[PDB]
Structure 1
Amino acid sequence: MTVEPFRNEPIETFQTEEARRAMREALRRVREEFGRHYPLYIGGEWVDTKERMVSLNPSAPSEVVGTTAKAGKAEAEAALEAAWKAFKTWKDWPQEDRSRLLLKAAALMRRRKRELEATLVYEVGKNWVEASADVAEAIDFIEYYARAALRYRYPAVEVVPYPGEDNESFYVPLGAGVVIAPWNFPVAIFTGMIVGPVAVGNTVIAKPAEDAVVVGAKVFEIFHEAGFPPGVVNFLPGVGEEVGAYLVEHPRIRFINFTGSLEVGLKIYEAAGRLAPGQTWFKRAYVETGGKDAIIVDETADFDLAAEGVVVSAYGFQGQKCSAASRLILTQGAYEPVLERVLKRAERLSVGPAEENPDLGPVVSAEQERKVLSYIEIGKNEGQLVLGGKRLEGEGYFIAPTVFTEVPPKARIAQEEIFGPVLSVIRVKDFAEALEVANDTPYGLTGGVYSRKREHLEWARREFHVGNLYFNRKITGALVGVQPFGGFKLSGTNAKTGALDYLRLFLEMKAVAERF
């Protein structure tokens, strides 16, 4: 297999008339199909159920964007049977063949970019560029993992020779596993978590997040058209913990790939450590569990650049990112200049229906709104509210960009992942204290430093204990291939997505010697 060197899919900015026209057409097509029903996908076919799940438009929650089938334990078991049956032959496909299948899926997804973007807009409340970045990243995962998988092809392991013998070490896939995907990047991360394991010969049962079932189904339309053999990829939308719990605890689930809340991640990791009755392996569980990410700014920084980066990082997709800047740590010299600029920029941000391409759409659901508002109430007792902190008018879950100042480093709003448009500003004496405050959370996902001082930057490179660190730029939007993505501490297991190392997680090694 020889293809062009990997490049990232360009993120559409919609600065041309053609791009804007194309988006409007896609938004129209998608909403004309709001009445659509999407079944489960099990063993190469769409399989419907009696019960259904409804997906709402968070910008207008009285509007249904689609319905899906609803998997229970029986359908989970059917999918598991199909996945193991498929594994028996899928594991033996030449890598070149599996990689070509991924490349086909990427081509198909690229051809449907605007459609998927418009679905993100209506289903999960992404503005236009957030939607485009999401789909572009999905394409990137497919393109990148297709290529990366070839690096592991038979026989890939470097061994020391021995006289009179062939010694051959090589990788083999694990088996059938479960993917539990997030609602915040329900094309990108949904896709990456499935296609990584699948690329190297595993099979996957995927549970989309409840809030993003329609767009997950559309991704499955792509997998189906690409022609993954029956059972290799399976789609099980479901309500609550039933489907996920059943699979995570199953003796015949080989691995679990999870991205979501720490609460759920902790339960999954604990369950994975147990031997279910009749289980014949040690389960692998990969969990990516969010962050409490800070941007540090010191007095040497470009304060305008810092303010812009902070606003993008804090409020892009309404702060609903594992990488979102939820803490702003300012040294004394930087405090007033940076805070004033942050407030000025943030107060100018628009909030409204996502299809209108506002700076912020709504938060994703009534439950998310409740959680964010509850944290805003907690914050009023811990820090000083200086901007936003309110629900905005309309049935859509519009919350204003929110800033708290004078926040104690150990306050709940300075420690707990709010996953909404809520920034906590912490004043510190100097850069050393800035690093101390940055490090003192249970998390370790993203972090940023705005500074011109080389010694501060290089010190942070060593000592700011986060998996993805960025200097003099936004701390969100990690690009596949460029910035291996994954954290430390309670941000999860450091499974670095969009990196060569990711695929190794879904392989085991065999060493075979022949004495002639």
Structure 2
Amino acid sequence: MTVEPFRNEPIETFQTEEARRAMREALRRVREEFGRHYPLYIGGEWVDTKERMVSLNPSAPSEVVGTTAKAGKAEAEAALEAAWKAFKTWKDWPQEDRSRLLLKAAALMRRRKRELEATLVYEVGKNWVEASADVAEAIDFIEYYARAALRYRYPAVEVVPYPGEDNESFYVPLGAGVVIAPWNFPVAIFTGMIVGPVAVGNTVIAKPAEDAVVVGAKVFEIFHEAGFPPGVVNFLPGVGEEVGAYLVEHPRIRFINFTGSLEVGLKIYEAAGRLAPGQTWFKRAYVETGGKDAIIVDETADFDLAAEGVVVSAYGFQGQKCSAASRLILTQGAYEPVLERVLKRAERLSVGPAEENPDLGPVVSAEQERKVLSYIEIGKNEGQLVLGGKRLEGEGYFIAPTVFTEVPPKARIAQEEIFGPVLSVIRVKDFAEALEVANDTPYGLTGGVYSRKREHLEWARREFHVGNLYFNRKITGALVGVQPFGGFKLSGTNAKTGALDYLRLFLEMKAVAERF
């Protein structure tokens, strides 16, 4: 297979009339389709259930974006049977054939990109550019993994020769596994976690997050149209603690690919270490969990550039990113100039229904709103509230951009992942103390430094202990291929997505010697 070198899918900014027109039409058609029902997808067919999952518009939660079927244990069992049956033959497809199937799925997704973006707008309250970045990242995962998988093809392993023998080592896929996905990047992360394993010959049962079931179904429409053989990919919208846990704990699930909260990731990793009755392997579990990500700014930085990057990092998609800047660590000389600029920029941010393309749409659900507002109340007794801290008026789950300052490094709001538009500003003496504070959390996902001092940058390169570190730019929006994504510590297992190494996680190696 020979294709053009990988390039990232451009993120639409909607600055041309042509792009606005296309997006307006896409939003109109998605809105016109509110209330549609999407079944499960098991063994190559759409399968309905009596029970359903309801997906609300967080900008106007009286509105039902759509419903899906709901998978329980019986549907999990049907999906397992379909996936294992498919694995038997899918594993034997030449890699080039599997990679071409991914490339077809990528082409179909690209052709439906405005529709998928519009679905994210309505279903999870992304503004237009956040929706565009999500979809472009999904396309990037497909394009990237399609190509990366060829690097593992038979027989890929470099071995030392031996006289009178052929020695051949090669990779094989593991089997049928479960993918359990978050609501915050429900096209990008959902797609990536599915297609990586599938590319190299595994089969997958995919469990979308409850708040993002409709867009998960549209991804499955694409998979079905592309023509993945029956059983290779299966779609099981349902309750995480029910069908999700059932699959995690099952003796016949080979691997678990999870992205989500630390709380859930911990349970999954523990469960994966147990031998379920009748289980005949050691389960692999990849868990990519939260962060409490900091940007450090020292007195040498471009303060205007820093303030802009902090505001993008903290408030992009309402701070509902594992990569979001939730801590701003300012050295003494940076404190006043940077905080003043951040406050000035943040107070200008618009908040409203996502379809209007505001700076911030709503948070995703009533439960998320409750948790964020609760953390705001906690924060009021830990640090100094200097901006926002309020729910805004309206049916949708609108929360104002919020800033606390003089926050103690050990405060709950400086340690725990809030996952909302809440920035905690921490004042430190110097760059050495900035690094100490940056590192002193249980997490290690993303981080940033704004500084012109080469020695501070290079020190952070060595010692700011996060998996994804950025200098003089935003700490969100890691690009597939460019920035292998994944963290340290309680940010997860360091499964680097959008990197060659990712696919090795879903392979095992055989070594076969023939003595002639």
Q: TM-score range by the shorter chain?
A: over 0.9
Q: Give the equivalent residue in structure 2 for 1:410.
A: 410
Distance in structure 1 (CA, Å) of the matches to 2:475 and 2:295: 8
* Alpha-carbon distance between aligned partners in 2 of 1:483 and 1:290, rounded to the nearest angstrom: 18
What do the CA deviations read for 1:280-309 (whole angstroms, capped 9, x no partner)?
A: 000000000010000000000000000000
> What TM-score results when the alignment is normalised by the length of structure 2?
1.00
CA distance in 2, matches of 1:38, 1:211: 14
Separation in structure 2 between the aligned mates of residue 251 and residue 240 of structure 1, nearest angstrom: 18
Residue deviations 1:194-213 (CA, integer Å, cap 9, x gap): 00000000000000000000
Q: 2:310: which partner in 1?
A: 310
| Cα shift readout 1:174-218 (whole Å, capped 9, x = no counterpart) | 000000001000000000000000000000000000000000000
Paired residue for 2:100? 100
CA distance in 1, matches of 2:402, 2:28: 32
For residues 435-490 of structure 1, give each alpha carbon's deviation from its aligned partner in whole angstroms, at most 9, with x where no partner exists: 00000000000000000000000000000000000000000000000000000000
What is the distance in 2 between the residues matched to 1:93 and 1:279? 27
Asked whether the 8 Å contact 2:262–2:289 carries over to 1, the reply is yes
**Secondary structure of the residue that 1:61 maps to in structure 2?**
coil
CA distance in 2, matches of 1:297, 1:424: 14
Name the structure 1 match of 2:224: 224
- 1:97-496 equivalent positions in 2, closer than 5 A: 97-496=97-496
Q: What is the deviation of 1:267? A: 0.2
Inter-partner Cα distance in structure 1 for 2:339 and 2:307? 8
Judge conservation of contact 2:200–2:507 (CA < 8 Å) in 1.
yes
Task: Find the aligned partners of 2:443 and 2:295 in 1 and give their Cα distance.
Answer: 14
Alpha-carbon distance, 1:35 to partner: 2.0
Aligned-partner SS, 2:278:
coil
Task: State how far apart, in whole Å, the 1-side matches of 2:259 and 2:448 are.
Answer: 22
C-alpha separation between the residues in 2 aligned to 1:189 and 1:35? Answer: 25
Cα displacement (A) at 1:53 = 1.1
Residues 17 and 252 of structure 1, relative CA distance in 2, 3 Å threshold: same
Other structure's SS at 2:240 match: coil
- Residues 3-47 of structure 1 show CA distances to partners (whole Å, capped at 9, x for unaligned) of 000000000000000100000000011011112100000000000
Query: Partners in 2 of 1:53 and 1:77 — Cα distance?
Result: 19
Alpha-carbon distance in 1 for matches of 2:477, 2:151: 26
Distance 1:125 1:46 in 2: 27
CA distance in 2, matches of 1:13, 1:474: 17
Change (3 A) 1:364 1:308: same
8 Å CA contact retained: 2:487, 2:494: yes
CA–CA separation in structure 1 for the residues paired with 2:240 and 2:202:
26
Does structure 1 retain, via aligned residues, the 8 Å contact 2:408–2:426? yes
Displacement of 1:345: 0.1
Mapped to 2, the partners of 1:493 and 1:484 lie a distance apart of: 13
User: Is contact 2:8–2:479 with CA below 8 Å preserved after alignment?
Assistant: yes
Aligned 8 A contact 2:125 2:361 in 1: yes
Q: Is contact 2:450-2:471 (8 Å) kept?
A: yes
Q: Quick check: 2:332–2:428 contact (8 Å CA) kept in 1?
A: yes
Structure-2 separation of matches of 1:447 and 1:52: 40
Structure 2: stretches of 5+ with no match in the other structure: none
Match of 2:327, SS?
strand
Deviations along 1:307-342, whole A, 9 cap, x unmatched? 000000000000000000000000000000000000
CA distance in 1, matches of 2:34, 2:510: 49
1:68 aligned counterpart, secondary structure: strand
* Structure 1 residue 239: Cα displacement: 2.4
Aligned pair in 2 of structure 1 residues 482, 114: CA closer, same or farther (>3 Å)?
Answer: same
Give the aligned partner of residue 5 of structure 1: 5
Paired with 2:49 and 2:58, the residues of 1 have a C-alpha distance of: 25
Structure 2: how far apart are the matches of 1:387 and 1:295? 19
Matched position secondary structure for 1:425: strand
1:131-161 CA-to-partner distances (Å, cap 9, x unmatched) read: 0000000000000000000000000000000
Rounded to whole Å, the distance in 1 between the matches of 2:475 and 2:27 is 29
Moved more, 198-207 or 231-240: 231-240
- SS of equivalent residue, structure 1 residue 408: coil
Gaps of 5+ in 1: none
Aligned partners of 1:33 and 1:234: how far apart in 2?
Answer: 24
- Which 10-residue stretch deviates more, 446-455 or 26-35? 26-35
Q: Are the equivalent residues in 1 in contact too, given 2:209–2:240 (CA < 8 A)?
A: no
Contact (CA 8 Å) 2:99, 2:150: kept in 1 or not?
yes
- 1:108-140 Cα distance to aligned partner (Å, 9 max, x none): 000000000000000000000000000000000
The whole-number CA distance in structure 1 between the counterparts of 2:251 and 2:164 is: 42
- Structure 1 residue 240: Cα displacement: 4.2
Q: What is the SS of the residue equivalent to 1:62?
A: coil
Q: What's the secondary structure of 2:152's corresponding residue? A: coil
In the aligned structure 1, how far is the partner of 2:411 from the partner of 2:170?
Answer: 50
Quote the Cα distance in structure 2 between the aligned partners of 1:28 and 1:461: 46
Deviates more, 1:178-187 or 1:240-249: 240-249
Deviations 1:321-378, CA, capped at 9 Å, x for gaps: 0000000000000000000000000000000000000000000000000000000000
> What SS does structure 2 have at the residue aligned with 1:107?
helix
CA RMSD, Structure 1 to Structure 2 (Å):
0.3
d(CA) in 1 for partners of 2:67 and 2:494?
Answer: 35
Contact 2:465/2:488, CA 8 A, preserved across alignment: yes
SS of 1:452 mapped into structure 2: coil
- Matched-pair contact (CA < 8 Å) for 2:204–2:233: yes
Structure 2 CA distance for aligned equivalents of residues 240 and 107 of structure 1:
31
Distance 1:244 1:15 in 2: 41
Greater than 3 Å deviation, 4+ residue runs = none
Asked if structure 1 preserves the Cα contact closer than 8 Å seen for 2:311 and 2:345, the reply is: yes
Separation in 2 of the partners of 1:397 and 1:484? 33
Stretch deviating more after TM superposition (234-243 or 139-148): 234-243
The 2-side partners of 1:54 and 1:180 are apart by 18
C-alpha separation in 2, matches of 1:284 and 1:51: 31
